[PDB]
Amino acid sequence: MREIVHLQAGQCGNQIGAKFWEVISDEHGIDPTGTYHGDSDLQLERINVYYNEATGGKYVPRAVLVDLEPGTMDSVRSGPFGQIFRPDNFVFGQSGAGNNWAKGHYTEGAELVDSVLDVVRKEAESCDCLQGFQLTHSLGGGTGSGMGTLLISKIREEYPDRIMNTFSVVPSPKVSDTVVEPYNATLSVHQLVENTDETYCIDNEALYDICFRTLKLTTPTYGDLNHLVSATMSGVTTCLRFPGQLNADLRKLAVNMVPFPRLHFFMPGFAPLTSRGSQQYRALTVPELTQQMFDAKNMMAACDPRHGRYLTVAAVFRGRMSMKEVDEQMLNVQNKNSSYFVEWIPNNVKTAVCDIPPRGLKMSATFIGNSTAIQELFKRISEQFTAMFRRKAFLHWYTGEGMDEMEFTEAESNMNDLVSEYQQYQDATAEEEGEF
């Protein structure tokens, strides 16, 4: 009735997507074979949001998995929870992109998109009332950022009056493992700023930082990093699937956050995260969620909001709970932190409450934060791209595939206009009106 079609691009997208379907099948009570083994009756009331009915009482996900290397597709097939996916939806090539954005966007990925859009159209038209799409990919690769941005451009032209989420893994300076990351990054940010409704910046430094000093975790494997990524992406759309006292889906969240269509780069965060040696020393109460949600430790990007200004924020709560404390605690942090919150817009906090908690927890919360402090990542990508493009380094790997040198120049101008656009809104006088 309100269907979200899932899109996975690249090796990083498939590792995230495999854990995401594992975390919400447990939430809805689905065995790896495909049937339903649960204890409540409201788990099947709204299950067509992500699942599609099959014969014999079997549920298959509404996901398509796309890659340019067949090695990942067999791994995500033969994984712990890879049996539930329909084998038609596994679309793949034979030659990899090669950590090259030009191969994925112009030459190699230009032939794979004919097969992908036929499957996407086939799966989206079957919905009675399509709600929107959702994509998980990484900007540091070739088959996720080269061809994932092409999937962005075709879908937005075909389905204009639809809402599209993306979960972009923004590249990181300190734990970078690929030399040509700023080449792949700045050629894709222009595609995400023009043809995407919501963008969430998920960074591997913050996933490592949460797993080190908050969880006190010994070995933070990629499964543990994707465990945090699947947390916010399960919790952001929990008002769609479960009833609550104050319901707000992702479209109502989109209206209350985005003041201008060029400002849609957000920051996620999951509130109730404790370590094994400190959980039984802590009480689970609404002020304890609000304190752990708003500090800069739990932000899932390399952005410190102290340098910037919080533009507009969310809190999506989960659990049976009395929302005086929800209506009081974010007012208290509104009145205290006067400088961090921009005074040009009053009472910018958006509130939603869902009745059904996650499995095994009685209370939980999720954060979405639009801040001007996101512009320091684009400036860091700009300076690393400027310092290397000026010497024409690694350029023959890109200019030999047909794209000329002016695409880089306009990619610089589009990002420099973006970082300046955030800068005017950060330093703007509210109590004045202009020439208009």
């Binding site: 067949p70 090695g71 597709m73 067999d74 097939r77 033969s78 890879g82 049996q83 793949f92």
Partner: peptide
């Protein structure tokens, strides 16, 4: 076994089959 196309494949065993 899952990654090879339907042509150019020997008869193998697919996973979960």
């Amino acid at each position: 076994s899952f990654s090879t196309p339907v042509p150019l494949s020997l008869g193998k065993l697919l996973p979960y089959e």
